[PDB]
């Protein structure tokens, strides 16, 4: 999951 | 569900200040929480992101270290680390869809909160009412001149009164004070009609009835 | 990020199409947000995801595009979308997104040529030393240049002007114009002049100091 990338 | 924006105020530079944005309705552990600020005569300009529904955390890659955001159970926060002049502005916090995948949705906003950034001290407004110098309907205003910071609240007749009431948007003057001025086009009477200035800053509260 | 430039205009029940654009794709390829912006309102999300209508938001907004490029189009214009609206872009790390500079919507309704009126300074206000003149335009479209004259001798500096936003039923604006003068300088003369001027059409106010 990346999430704030 | 609601946001409320509190904190904003006058800071000389280099006075760290707080900002919160206080969340009713929903759980922040849910979503993601985003700032956004606007310089006045400025475009909007994204901030930072902080989400509850996963834990991570971003800046924009200009922030450099001047923000800080942190959370609460029931509120996010956003630090000035070093205020400028540059970060005066009215700062707004919204809620954005949350998962693995990030963020997107901004959807909802509080109605934002007035950072100012100034060497100046907190100063009241002083208040002057307009008159014309033969009709059936006559316009009579107020001058509030001289305040800082912004804002400053304008009612007429204690908010009884409110069809064709024209406040204008303020202006900085060079001195870094502000002035503006409302008017209201009532029905000529043998009526008196007062406006009620308020100055949240310096809890100053005055009222001036006007004689046409 | 790189919008129609500002100003863009726009008649009542008429069609306008903004377009935005991005140096980098958009999350995803789609990943684009429009917002309204008027003074004073939070923000108000109107498309999510390039072509995503936020709820409760008016079939006349739609929005479509990929990759890097975007448009905002909207249809059956009413005065009440005079704004400013800016498209966000979301990149795959949070720290890039990004607001574009803005695209300011001017609605173009029915002309009205204003109602001028001028305030002299109130008593209390010539004992501080320093007076301010209000002229006022009301209800009006399009734009308008402001002129004050004293004793017939247009003046050059000391003046202020602020217009509000464009009225949310009939598109029209209101404007003050202030003159500041020292005390001794409005004493010493007579006649009060502001002239407000649309297109080739004039509208004149005026006041003599002493029938006051």
């Not at chain 2, 060497?119 to 316009?139: D, E, H, I, N, R």
């Not at chain 3, 509000?164 to 007579?190: E, G, I, R, V």
């Amino acid at each position: 999951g990346k999430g704030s990338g | 569900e609601q946001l409320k924006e509190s904190g904003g105020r006058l800071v000389a530079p280099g006075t760290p200040l707080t900002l919160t944005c206080t969340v009713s309705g929903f759980d922040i552990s849910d979503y993601a929480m985003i700032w956004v600020r606007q310089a006045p005569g400025k475009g909007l300009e994204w901030i930072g992101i902080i989400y509850g529904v996963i834990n991570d955390l971003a800046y924009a890659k200009w922030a450099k270290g001047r923000f800080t955001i942190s959370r609460t159970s029931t509120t996010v926060d956003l630090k000035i680390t070093s205020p400028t002049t540059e970060d005066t502005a009215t700062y707004f916090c919204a809620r954005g869809y949350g998962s693995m995948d990030g963020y997107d949705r901004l959807n909802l906003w509080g109605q934002g909160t007035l950072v100012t950034v100034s060497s100046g001290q907190p100063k009241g407004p002083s208040v002057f009412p307009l008159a014309p110098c033969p009709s059936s309907t006559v316009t009579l205003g107020c001058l509030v001149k001289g305040y800082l910071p912004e804002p400053v609240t304008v009612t007429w007749n204690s908010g009884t009164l409110t069809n064709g009431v024209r406040t204008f948007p303020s202006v900085r003057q060079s001195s870094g004070l502000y002035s503006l001025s409302s008017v209201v086009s009532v029905t000529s009477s043998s009526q008196p009609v007062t406006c009620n200035v308020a100055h949240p800053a310096t809890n100053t509260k005055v009222d001036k009835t006007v004689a046409p | 990020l790189t919008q129609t430039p500002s100003p863009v205009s726009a008649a009542v029940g008429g069609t306008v199409t903004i377009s935005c654009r991005s140096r980098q794709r958009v999350y995803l390829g789609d990943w684009l947000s429009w917002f309204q912006k008027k003074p004073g309102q939070p923000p108000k999300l109107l498309i999510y995801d390039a072509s995503f209508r936020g709820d409760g938001v008016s079939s006349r907004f739609s929005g479509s595009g990929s990759g890097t490029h975007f448009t905002l189009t909207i249809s059956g214009v009413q005065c009440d979308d005079a704004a400013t609206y800016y498209c966000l872009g979301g990149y795959y790390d949070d720290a890039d997104d990004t607001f574009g500079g803005g695209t300011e919507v001017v609605v173009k309704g029915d002309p009205v040529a204003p109602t001028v009126l001028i305030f002299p300074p109130a008593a209390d206000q010539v004992a501080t030393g320093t007076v301010t003149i209000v002229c006022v335009a009301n209800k009006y479209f399009p734009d308008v240049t402001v002129t004050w004259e004293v004793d017939g001798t247009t003046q050059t500096t000391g003046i202020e002007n602020s217009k509000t936003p464009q009225n949310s039923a009939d598109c029209t604006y209101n404007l003050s114009s202030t003159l500041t003068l020292t005390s001794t300088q409005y004493n010493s003369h007579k006649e009060y002049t502001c002239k407000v001027t649309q297109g080739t059409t004039s509208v004149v106010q005026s006041f003599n100091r002493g029938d006051c």
